[PDB]
Design a protein around this motif. Structure first.
Motif, mmCIF file in Angstrom:
data_model
loop_
_atom_site.group_PDB
_atom_site.id
_atom_site.type_symbol
_atom_site.label_atom_id
_atom_site.label_comp_id
_atom_site.label_asym_id
_atom_site.label_seq_id
_atom_site.Cartn_x
_atom_site.Cartn_y
_atom_site.Cartn_z
ATOM 1 N N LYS A 1 -39.226 24.333 35.022
ATOM 2 C CA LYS A 1 -38.803 24.733 33.864
ATOM 3 C C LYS A 1 -39.909 24.749 32.586
ATOM 4 O O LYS A 1 -40.604 23.813 32.936
ATOM 5 N N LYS B 1 -38.777 22.767 25.938
ATOM 6 C CA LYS B 1 -37.676 23.390 25.109
ATOM 7 C C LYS B 1 -37.698 22.649 23.646
ATOM 8 O O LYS B 1 -36.444 22.986 23.009
ATOM 9 N N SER C 1 -25.377 21.313 22.344
ATOM 10 C CA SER C 1 -24.813 22.189 23.601
ATOM 11 C C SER C 1 -25.518 23.365 23.724
ATOM 12 O O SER C 1 -26.051 23.847 24.824
ATOM 13 N N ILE D 1 -28.580 24.440 22.616
ATOM 14 C CA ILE D 1 -29.964 24.395 23.274
ATOM 15 C C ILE D 1 -30.105 23.905 24.749
ATOM 16 O O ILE D 1 -30.677 24.534 25.559
ATOM 17 N N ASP D 2 -29.106 23.250 25.176
ATOM 18 C CA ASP D 2 -29.019 22.776 26.708
ATOM 19 C C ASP D 2 -27.341 22.732 26.930
ATOM 20 O O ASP D 2 -26.896 21.351 26.560
ATOM 21 N N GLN E 1 -27.343 28.313 29.073
ATOM 22 C CA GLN E 1 -28.726 28.126 28.474
ATOM 23 C C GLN E 1 -29.507 29.381 28.229
ATOM 24 O O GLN E 1 -29.572 30.292 29.043
ATOM 25 N N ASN F 1 -33.253 30.796 28.222
ATOM 26 C CA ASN F 1 -34.457 30.439 28.776
ATOM 27 C C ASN F 1 -35.802 31.245 27.992
ATOM 28 O O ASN F 1 -36.881 30.995 28.178
ATOM 29 N N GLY G 1 -35.747 16.591 28.950
ATOM 30 C CA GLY G 1 -34.821 17.591 29.025
ATOM 31 C C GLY G 1 -34.511 18.291 27.446
ATOM 32 O O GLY G 1 -34.175 19.438 27.590
ATOM 33 N N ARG G 2 -34.778 17.615 26.443
ATOM 34 C CA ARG G 2 -34.521 18.253 25.281
ATOM 35 C C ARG G 2 -35.515 17.429 24.059
ATOM 36 O O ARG G 2 -35.779 16.168 24.190
#
Ligand SMILES: Nc1ncnc2c1ncn2[C@@H]1O[C@H](COP(=O)(O)OP(=O)(O)OP(=O)(O)O)[C@@H](O)[C@H]1O
Ligand SMILES: Nc1ncnc2c1ncn2[C@@H]1O[C@H](COP(=O)(O)OP(=O)(O)OP(=O)(O)O)[C@@H](O)[C@H]1O
Ligand SMILES: Nc1ncnc2c1ncn2[C@@H]1O[C@H](COP(=O)(O)OP(=O)(O)O)[C@@H](O)[C@H]1O
Ligand SMILES: Nc1ncnc2c1ncn2[C@@H]1O[C@H](COP(=O)(O)OP(=O)(O)O)[C@@H](O)[C@H]1O
Lengths: 493, 349, 143
Positions: free
Chosen positions: A37, A40, A129, A131-132, A136, A138, A160-161
């Motif tokens: 991935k 982000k 929430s 944003i991820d 989601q 992409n 992850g964020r």
């Protein structure tokens, strides 16, 4: 790369590109093979006006993505008409609309969240929430910017964020040269800039100038040139640059030091030379050596002895780029919880420069000391004792000077073990010092022998400031009585 | 799902409703190996992973890594390999993994110890060796023994004697996976009811690692001013109760302290909470002074003899930090006058 | 100059004119040839009754610009019927209306704003409007 006009951000830009954008430019088949991935989030922080937004907008155009849309923290915070969630949703609405319209291959949409420190309190949940979450997008990228890195809560930083950070600091000399070369490109292209200007000199004169000050300086020089031409084939020239040379924010202002250094220094005896030499040694040590990044000192002595002037003189002769004074007459009527903030903020700026000096004067008035039963402040005492041993971030340096007229009272409070070393400033103690001071000042003329005949017999004990006061007062008499009255007043002490 | 099992009220837990509980903790070495094997499956399936990578080494290097950090590490390594390929048949290789190896939350940080360990340690006499030896024995006892899960200690001495560096040197050599420092200069302006929360939160992390170590430095500042005895009671109680709390079954701790005022602590009934205490003395004889001077390596032979011929006669009493300050200051003079000024300064104490 | 009815403000007027308006009277081709943004604010401070507003209005007529519209701090501060933003928006209404329709050749508009009450030890909306994503080159704010 030079076409975006960003100078002094080689390393930060390189690392950001590497971590955040390497995947998106690689041929899609291979990245689809490895199944990784995309990042982000991004977080930028630093002192205001160093080129954060101008980097985000150019990163936006670099990928050839859609143009961004901005938001502000407090603007979103105050809405409580049921729009608190609507604003959050509508911003991402277009992104998910296009994601459904096309699919996974939709073009990315950027959003810039300024002042993100306001959202996080030491509204969050819905953004987090979106944003991820279970669903989601992409095809989005979020970029945060802030000036108070500490006050962001841990929730946004776990991987992850908002996975990356970078720090955009004040440019060093090469950065300044590159920015100056960037901003005056067009004029030199059209041959309006004269041939006498040398950018390399402005590069060394403007110490601790941030990004925007250089642009302001150029604009002011251009305005001055225009004004000269119109008289209240024109060319901006060196004189306009010098005349225009704006007050920096992290630099030195002469007005304060003019206010505290009023009449210079007169070497009337050995103690003055001793004090000045010790000051010079301390300055050299804190400039050159790397085994002592923090040095403190405390000048103390009797009242009316000459402490503030010597401290300011020592400070000013250093040539450090950053000099500041924390005096207690800028805080008339404040409560304790505002004095703490003022002191903390004055200190927190000296950590963002490669050298610095901070002068804390009249300590006993910061504490609100009064000996009719011991009354003082504990918040200020603690906040001040903690700060005198705080070490600056890696690779920087700091020098603190003190001042006080009541030593033993401080010694009782267990403060003298926080200052590395101390100095003593004595009063005048012999007739020879008195005559030398009188001669150096240059006021009296035969009258010198008249004074000497009487003063030489005894020993005297009088601070320098009081002597200045007396010798200044007596001059208003008629000429034939001046010496007589000067003797009378002095004999009363 | 929750991160705070304590604050759920009893109403939901009585049988017939939410009848079961479980704890999902940090994985141990086998868990880490299995997660790493899971995440790099596809690349090895398509033969993009090079043949030099050995998962079993990453399995032992990443101590106290949580579930998500491993995935993050793999993603970063792949990104770095891509970037290298494009130059600012690709194969992610060991070097990218090493370079990329992220900051674990429950792991070790380097910047703090860099800040508290400034110039190392210099053996200028017996006391340093004795203190280091005792520290090593304590670390061994907490690592190997089974009848003493919790161990405490308190280093103390006169001002400017060299405590904090010794504490950080003892702690940093333990190689424990989890090392943390609680310091008073991260709480400027906080109120007491925030200091309590900060301390409690710092402690409630060391209970989730199979080993740990915590440093509490300058206890006298966490509380004290002797113009009338003024201090804080909340902080004192929370600290007096936390020094005897035991971790859950099978986990081990080590709390190192520090302070310069031992008598005040003794009056307040705190010397009975620390298991043992250690003393760090000052320089006391000319021979120690010459040893320190030689070790630092500033003056030469002739200056050494010049200083010795005078200093040997008397005895001195000066902390190590002050001697470092002075010997650093005197160097700025011209080469002629270094010795004279250094001797004058030392003579002024 | 004497037709303006001001005496004892020679230095201040000269410095303000030089720094703030020298670019707005030079031939457009040259100023466009050098690419310089125009100043966007002023700040005048002093004891009551020394001639500040009369200088703002006189400067207004000096450039031959459209007449100004004034505002008051504590008046705006108390309005909390949702018009805290609507008022601010409608203030620059004419300049926004003309900018997108005439571009470079718009006639600069003025506003005269007790600015110290707002800044408390509504700021952000005004700050964005004077300098945000959009940047009107035909406004001038005097506090
Ligand atoms: N060698 C000297 N050292 C200090 N001050 C000198 C010397 N020679 C002349 N002066 C003059 O003496 C005055 C010094 O007063 P200063 O500002 O030090 O007061 P202070 O010690 O802070 O006072 P107080 O104890 O009342 O707070 C200045 O006007 C300075 O120009
Ligand atoms: N053997 C040694 N023991 C301790 N410190 C040493 C030794 N040799 C050199 N040093 C240096 O001495 C300094 C130790 O100062 P330290 O941090 O212990 O201060 P401290 O005793 O906590 O001070 P204070 O009482 O003022 O808070 C460090 O710079 C360290 O590198
Ligand atoms: N290389 C550079 N670094 C910093 N500032 C620059 C640079 N080049 C130009 N600038 C100027 O800096 C000004 C302020 O930048 P800005 O985007 O406001 O940063 P911030 O949002 O951090 O204040 C811009 O108007 C721009 O013209
Ligand atoms: N040169 C001058 N300096 C100061 N005031 C003047 C001058 N010439 C005229 N005035 C008078 O000043 C008055 C306006 O003052 P005003 O602008 O209301 O002060 P403020 O700016 O503090 O509100 C007018 O009535 C005018 O007659």
């Amino acid at each position: 790369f030079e076409k975006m006009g960003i100078g002094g951000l080689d390393k930060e830009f390189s690392d950001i590109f590497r971590r955040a954008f390497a995947s998106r430019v690689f041929p899609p088949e291979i990245v689809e093979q490895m199944g990784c991935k995309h990042v982000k989030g991004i977080l930028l922080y630093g002192p205001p006006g160093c080129g954060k937004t101008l980097l985000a907008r150019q990163i936006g155009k670099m990928l050839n993505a859609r143009e961004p849309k901005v938001v502000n923290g407090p603007e979103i915070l105050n809405k409580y008409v049921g729009e608190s969630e609507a604003n959050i949703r509508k911003l991402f609405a277009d992104a998910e609309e296009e994601q459904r319209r096309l699919g996974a291959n939709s073009g990315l949409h950027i959003i810039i969240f300024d002042e993100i420190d306001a959202i996080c309190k030491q509204v969050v949940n819905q953004l987090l929430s979106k944003i991820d979450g279970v669903e989601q997008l992409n095809n989005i990228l979020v970029i945060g910017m802030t000036n108070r890195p500490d006050l962001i809560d841990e929730a946004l930083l776990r991987p992850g964020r908002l996975e990356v950070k970078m720090e955009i600091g004040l440019p060093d000399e090469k950065g300044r040269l590159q920015i100056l070369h960037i901003h005056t490109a067009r004029m030199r292209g059209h041959q309006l800039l004269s041939a006498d200007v040398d950018i390399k000199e402005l590069a060394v004169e403007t110490k601790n100038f941030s990004g925007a000050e250089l642009e302001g300086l150029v604009r002011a020089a251009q305005s001055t040139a225009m004004n000269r031409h119109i008289k209240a084939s024109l060319q901006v020239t060196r004189g306009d640059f010098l005349a225009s040379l704006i007050k920096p924010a992290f630099g030195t202002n002469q007005e304060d030091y003019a206010s505290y250094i009023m009449n210079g220094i007169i070497k009337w005896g050995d103690p003055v030379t001793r004090v000045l030499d010790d000051g010079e040694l301390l300055v050299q040590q804190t400039k050159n050596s790397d085994r002592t990044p923090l040095v403190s000192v405390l000048l103390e002595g009797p009242p009316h002895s000459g402490k503030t002037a010597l401290a300011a003189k020592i400070a000013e002769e250093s040539n450090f780029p950053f000099i500041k004074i924390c005096s207690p007459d800028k805080m008339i009527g404040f409560s304790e919880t505002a004095k703490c903030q003022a002191m903390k903020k004055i200190f927190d700026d000296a950590y963002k420069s490669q050298l610095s000096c901070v002068v804390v004067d009249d300590i006993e008035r910061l504490l609100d000391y009064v000996p009719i039963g011991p009354r003082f402040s504990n918040l200020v005492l603690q906040a001040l004792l903690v700060l005198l041993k705080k070490a600056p971030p890696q690779g920087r340096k700091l020098l603190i000077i003190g001042t006080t007229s009541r030593k033993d009272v401080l010694q009782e409070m267990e403060m003298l073990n926080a200052f590395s070393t101390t100095i003593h400033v004595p009063n005048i103690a012999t007739g020879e010092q008195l005559l030398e001071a009188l001669e150096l000042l240059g006021n009296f003329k035969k009258e010198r022998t008249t004074i000497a005949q009487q003063v030489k017999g005894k020993k005297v004990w009088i601070g320098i400031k009081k002597l200045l006061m007396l010798i200044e007062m007596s001059l208003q008499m008629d000429p034939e009585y001046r010496v007589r009255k000067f003797l009378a007043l002095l004999r009363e002490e | 799902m929750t991160n705070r099992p304590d604050l759920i009220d009893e109403a939901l837990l009585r049988p017939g409703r939410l009848e079961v509980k479980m704890e999902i903790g940090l994985p141990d070495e086998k868990g880490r190996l299995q997660i790493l094997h899971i995440h790099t499956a596809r690349m090895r399936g398509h033969q993009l992973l090079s043949a030099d990578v050995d998962i079993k080494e990453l399995a032992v290097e990443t101590k106290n890594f949580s579930g998500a950090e491993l995935e993050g590490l793999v993603r970063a390594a792949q990104s770095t390999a891509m970037n290298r390929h494009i130059k600012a048949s690709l194969q992610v290789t060991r070097g990218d993994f090493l370079a990329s190896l992220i900051k674990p939350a429950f792991g070790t940080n380097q910047e703090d110890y860099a800040s508290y360990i400034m110039n190392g340690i210099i053996k200028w006499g017996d006391p340093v060796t004795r203190v280091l030896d005792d520290g090593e024995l304590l670390v061994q006892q907490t690592k190997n023994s089974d009848r003493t899960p919790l161990v405490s200690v308190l280093l103390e001495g006169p001002p400017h004697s060299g405590k904090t560096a010794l504490a950080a040197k003892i702690a940093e050599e333990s190689n424990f996976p989890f090392i943390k420092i609680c310091s008073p200069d991260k709480m400027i302006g906080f109120s007491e009811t925030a200091k309590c929360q900060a301390m409690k939160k710092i402690f409630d992390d060391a209970y989730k690692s199979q080993l740990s170590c915590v440093v509490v430095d300058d206890i006298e500042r966490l509380l004290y001013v002797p113009i009338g005895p003024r201090f804080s009671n909340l902080v004192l109680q929370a600290l007096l109760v936390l020094l005897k709390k035991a971790p859950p079954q099978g986990r081990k701790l080590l709390i190192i302290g520090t302070t310069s005022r031992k008598d005040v602590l003794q009056e307040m009934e705190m010397l009975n909470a620390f298991s043992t205490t250690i003393h760090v003395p000052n320089i006391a004889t000319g021979e120690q002074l010459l040893e320190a001077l030689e070790l630092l390596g500033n003056f030469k032979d002739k200056e050494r003899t010049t200083i010795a011929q005078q200093v040997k006669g008397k005895k001195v009493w000066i902390g190590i930090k002050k001697l470092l300050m002075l010997i650093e200051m005197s160097l700025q003079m011209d080469p002629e006058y270094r010795v004279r000024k250094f001797l004058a300064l030392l003579r002024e104490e």
